[PDB]
Amino acid sequence: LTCVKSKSIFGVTTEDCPDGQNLCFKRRHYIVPKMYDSTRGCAATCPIAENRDVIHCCGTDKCNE
């Protein structure tokens, strides 16, 4: 599995996930309403949506882009 690790106006980083990490995630952490910072990566289990988080997990290559 490959997951996007960074995606910006400057470039994109893709990671081949290590053994045991067969999910990609994209986490949107909201600072104020309708404004948020996005983090992405591989994961073994879908990360917990903590305070102010919306988290999407998926299982195909670069599905979190």
Numbering used by the authors: 1 to 65
Quote from the publication:
In addition, mamba venoms contain aminergic toxins that recognize various bioaminergic receptors. Aminergic toxins belong to the three-finger fold toxin (3FT) superfamily, a structural fold known to support a large diversity of biological functions. Despite sequence identities that vary from 70 to 98%, aminergic toxins display highly variable pharmacological profiles. Here, we use the ancestral protein resurrection methodology on the aminergic toxin group in order to pinpoint the functional substitutions which may have occurred during their evolution and use them for molecular engineering.
In order to visually understand the evolution of the AncTxs, the crystallographic structure of AncTx1 (variant W28R-I38S) was solved. As it might have been expected, the structure was rigid, except at the tips of the three loops. AncTx1W28R-I38S represents well AncTx1 as the two mutations on loop 2 do not perturb the structure, as can be verified by comparing AncTx1W28R-I38S with MT2. Loop 1 is more susceptible to backbone variations, and both MT7 and MT2 are subjected to a large kink at the tip of this loop. The selectivity of AncTx1 is characterized by a slightly higher affinity for α1A and a much lower one for the α1B and α2C receptors, relative to ρ-Da1a. Having recognized that the substitution (I38S) in AncTx3 affects α1D binding and that (W28R) increases α1B and α2C binding, the appropriate substitutions were integrated stepwise in AncTx1 to boost its selectivity. The pKi values for the AncTx1 double variant W28R-I38S were calculated to be 8.59, 6.41, 3.71 and 4.85 toward α1A, α1B, α1D and α2C respectively showing that despite an impressive loss in α1D affinity (3.71 vs. 6.58 for AncTx1), the selectivity of this variant suffered from a large pKi gain toward α1B (6.41 vs. 4.75 for AncTx1 I38S). We increased the affinity of AncTx1 for the α1B, α1D or α2C receptors with just two variants, unfortunately without achieving our primary goal to improve selectivity. Epistasis, a phenomenon already stated as important in protein evolution may have been the cause as revealed by other ancestral resurrection studies. Indeed, the functional effects of a substitution could depend on its surrounding context or sequence background.
